[PDB]
Amino acid sequence: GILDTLKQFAKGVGKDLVKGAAQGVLSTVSCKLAKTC
């Protein structure tokens, strides 16, 4: 349903964030003075 629909994309504009967190990691996170990575 609609309540699964928004959840699907949310659990994907959340994977992209987990992917964004899972980018460097230490290089990005440490590099993340003002997100210069």
**Residue 33 φ then ψ, to 5°:** -65, -55
| Two tokens, residue 32 | 């993340």
CA distance 37 to 24: 8
Q: How far is CA 21 from CA 5, 24, 26, in A?
A: 24, 8, 10
Q: Enter the tokens of residue 19.
A: 């992917």
CB 37 within 8 A of CB 28: yes
Q: In this structure, what DSSP letter does residue 24 have?
A: S
HSE-CB for 22 with a 13 A CA cutoff:
6
